[PDB]
Design a protein. Structure first.
Lengths: 74, 147, 147, 74, 147, 74
């Protein structure tokens, strides 16, 4: 399965999705800079509308514990 | 790990498969539970950075946590470099170089280098510095993964 | 633990994983049953305070009992300090310091310090003092947890 | 789960509750003095009315074996 | 593998059955998963080419992958021979011969020859060259076997 | 469970009861002299009427193999 095919379900907790992401990211072998680009970009983009909304409110500069606690009720 | 030989010197010996597997099994069974930290601590007795990356890299599953830890290890490493600046002028022929955050994380150092620092007189406890970062990052995880 | 080497000296060696796991398994299977105390006693042969906190800290479950024990260990430690006052004047350069309740509990002492006291001549049995507190506190538990 | 969310059931033995308390207290990392404050305070407060009544009769100065034997029939 | 003896020399010792079986079990359980590569790396510590063919030959199942690996090992070996030409004139009586891709793959060399190269001064790391080919070929597999 | 609460059933073999007794006696920590007193006293007292009758016929001075073989058919 390709990294672009990794997406969050409509009922799937973000948490279970983030695990899937760094597992697939774990099978990507690209430069770190590209993998940083993938992190800030693709993760949020394939996140579900309800959490996506939430993550837009965190702004930039956000870290994984704060994202992970931010989308917990969703 | 670096262990003491019968002759009375500190030499490196490899870690055992049923030790490895015991590390695996702990993680399988007790996931993020607090008992994991003393357990870790016992199984990390006399361990190198290199052995500590081996243990972290051999995890399967809980990849959100594994990424949070990585990022904590780099933060704690960035902080090592900040707090301890590089030293004045060129490195002496008679001496060996001071470590950076990445040498502590095992990344920029070689094994023989990791054995130089620990076995040399005075010795520097680069295991114990990484160990606190691991334990600190373990607290972060435990606190988050509480429900 | 602190064990005798082939050369004929007392040196520290780490406790084994299937020893650790055997401690875990006993607790899993027989909980508060009396057979736990001889069992403990055998597996604590030549053990340090540090190793004894490791064994107590690595428990999962039975947290009411674990707290009752802690509080017994501190009471017994408070009692050590009471009964044995600190000694007259400054500590000699030629000598090493007398332990407190918290050194016996392993808390304020380091491993090398725990090895100094036990290996030195006369030796002081800080393991056996903690061991009685553990066994005493084990009686408290056993008596309570009888139904 | 937060430490404030730990409470005793109406039919739950205190004992099973005290175990839950020092497990969650085991995942709190606060200063010892604060954790002492939590011990004397929160434990009794979220204890059920029948045992709560019992514990009020023990007065202060009470230790865990005496609390644990005090609320046994409840 | 080639291990250091108590006397302070490097001697060959055989690999253990529960090590062998642990290699088998990893492959059984985690198939092509990435954790297989650090795992491999730990269990290949101090290993010979001969021991590495033993480990590859003792696989059952996943024969498409096993063939892809073989063919990668030969490609990487063909590349060794290309990059490193044979040396000028006849082999010296005082010296031992330079390896080829097939000596690195263990095929054309004998054990005593594999011990000559590794134990001699300077030593040549024919394990680590095969190890990269194995890891490289492991990446090929992992990338393909991703779904 | 307390040692006074250990009693023999109306259909329970003595044997199964004696096992229960030295298990509970095993969790009593009292002086040996007191535990000797408990042995000769409480064991027979909480024994069932049919075996109790039997044990009265053994008289004093009796040892455990003889008590245990004495109440076997009961």
């Amino acid at each position: 399965t390709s990294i672009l095919d990794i997406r969050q379900g409509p009922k799937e907790p973000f948490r279970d999705y983030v695990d899937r992401f760094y597992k697939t990211l774990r099978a990507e072998q690209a430069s770190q800079e590209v993998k940083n680009w993938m992190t800030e970009t693709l993760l949020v983009q394939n996140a579900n509308p309800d959490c996506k909304t939430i993550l837009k409110a965190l702004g930039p500069g956000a870290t994984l514990e704060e994202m992970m606690t931010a989308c917990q009720g969703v | 790990p670096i262990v003491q030989n019968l002759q009375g010197q500190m030499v490196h010996q490899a870690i055992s498969p049923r030790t490895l597997n015991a590390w695996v099994k702990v993680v399988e069974e007790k996931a993020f539970s607090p008992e994991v930290i003393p357990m870790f601590s016992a199984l990390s007795e006399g361990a190198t950075p290199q052995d500590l990356n081996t243990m972290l890299n051999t995890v399967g599953g809980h990849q959100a946590a594994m990424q949070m830890l990585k990022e904590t290890i780099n933060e704690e490493a960035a902080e090592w470099d900040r707090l301890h600046p590089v030293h004045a002028g060129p490195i002496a022929p008679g001496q060996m170089r001071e470590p950076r955050g990445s040498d502590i994380a095992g990344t920029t150092s070689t094994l023989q280098e990791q054995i130089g620092w620990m076995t040399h007189n005075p010795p520097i406890p680069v295991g114990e510095i990484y160990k606190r970062w691991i334990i600190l990052g373990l607290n972060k995880i435990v606190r988050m993964y509480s429900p």
